[PDB]
Design a protein around this ligand. Structure first.
Ligand code: HEM
Length: 392
């Protein structure tokens, strides 16, 4: 019987099995939720090998009849979204619009984190740091980044509990939501009041006849895809980083006292983060040797990020947060190679600012329920608790 993936929906603790698997079988046959076979890769060396070799293709994971990690929740072409962006001549533009350096942006993040936190302090403990802090901070950020009205955020957010499912079967709601969100974005592109952020930029490139080969659909897809990827990734990461920090009171206290180390703290929280529920999928486009396995053309490979990130061969004392590591950014939390996360800078600043605000307003933050009372979302592309009850 094949080892089934994923092993655990819990985002607070790495299963003991990962260390077992990594040492003895850093590439191992598994079965996914669709019933497909796959190669799960779990050492830093093999994970990096896979991500650095472009013949392990992201685009081709959408190929018809390919073994699948999970059901598509987007059109097959949209799996190649970053490639379409590059081909449309929109790459450095997209990347420029999603940098945290934008005028006023970091102060907006800061003031938004502090306002959310003041509201929670007024309502009284317990507070839910996912639904009433991390996710709203993520959503407010991405509305600003995209240049769309803040009041439009909640509804785009609504789609995400389905869009980012990791399902054995197709999801009818995913298509309905996708089509509505695409239509919304299309409308944003023609709205002359939208002059800032990613959509403001994309909108004026759309008016340019030099971009006449670029469909309206792709422009709109970029907005929907970046909003969703950024909101789900930042909100989910911050949420489970807060659990990591809460469980390490002396770290909490150290960062509160020495906020200059908060970036180093966040980098370690990224390294040990369990937010990705599944390995990153790739399809082999050739026969390629990975460890003791010849991966065959057409086979699915899953790059287990926490495999690499907890690998003591690369990170000594891997379960420990150490702020003085010599190569602290070398984890795979943002991936590697061709598909390295284009939002990584913004991801770091969202978490840095969110944590700094929280530590200053709630220096005594702690869980308000036993950790085993958290409800872990299942069959989802991220590991998150439904609610994160705290007191302070
Ligand atoms: C802590 C926050 C974040 C984490 C941990 C994270 C993680 C990742 C990872 C691991 C990948 C690589 C996927 C792969 O190679 O298969 C990725 C790619 C991606 N991320 Fe992020 N991400 C974060 C924030 C963001 C933000 C803020 C945005 C946009 C606003 C974003 C947009 C994207 C997009 C569009 C891709 C696909 C790139 C491609 O296909 O080439 N992410 N992210």
């Amino acid at each position: 019987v094949l080892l089934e993936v994923p092993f655990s929906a819990r985002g607070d603790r790495i299963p003991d099995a990962v260390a077992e698997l990594r040492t003895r079988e850093p590439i191992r046959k598994v079965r996914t939720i669709t019933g497909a076979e796959a190669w799960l890769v779990s050492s830093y060396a093999l994970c990096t090998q896979v991500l650095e070799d472009r013949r392990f293709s992201m685009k081709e994971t959408a190929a018809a009849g390919a073994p699948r990690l999970n059901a598509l929740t987007v059109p097959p072409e949209v799996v190649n979204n970053m490639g379409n962006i590059a081909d449309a001549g929109l790459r450095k533009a997209v990347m420029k619009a999603i940098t945290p350096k934008a005028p006023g942006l970091e102060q907006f993040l800061r003031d938004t984190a502090n306002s959310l936190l003041d509201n929670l302090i007024t309502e009284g403990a317990p507070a839910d740091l996912r639904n009433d802090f991390a996710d709203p901070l993520a959503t407010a950020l991405h509305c600003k980044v995209l240049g769309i009205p803040q009041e439009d955020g909640p509804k785009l957010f609504r789609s995400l509990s389905i869009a980012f499912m990791s399902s054995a079967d197709p999801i009818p709601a995913a298509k309905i939501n996708w089509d509505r969100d695409i239509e919304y974005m299309a409308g944003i592109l023609e709205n002359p009041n939208i002059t800032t952020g990613l959509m403001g930029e994309l909108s004026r490139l759309r008016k340019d006849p030099a971009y006449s080969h670029v469909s309206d659909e792709l422009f709109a897809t970029i907005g929907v895809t970046f909003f969703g990827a950024g909101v789900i990734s930042t909100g989910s990461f911050l949420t489970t980083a807060l659990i990591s920090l809460i469980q390490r009171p002396q770290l909490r206290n150290l960062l509160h006292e020495k906020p200059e180390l908060i970036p180093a703290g966040v980098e370690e929280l990224l390294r040990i983060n369990l937010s990705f529920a599944d390995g990153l999928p790739r399809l082999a486009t050739a026969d390629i040797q990975v460890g003791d396995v010849l991966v065959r053309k057409g086979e699915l490979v899953l790059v287990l990020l926490e495999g690499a990130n907890f690998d003591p061969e690369h990170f000594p004392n891997p379960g420990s947060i150490e702020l003085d590591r010599p190569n602290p950014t070398s984890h795979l939390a943002f991936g590697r190679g061709q598909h390295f996360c284009p939002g990584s800078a913004l991801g770091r600043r969202h978490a840095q600012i969110g944590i700094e605000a929280l530590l200053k307003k709630m220096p005594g933050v702690d869980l308000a329920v036993p950790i085993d009372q958290l409800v872990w979302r299942t069959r989802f592309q991220r590991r998150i608790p439904e609610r994160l009850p705290v007191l302070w």
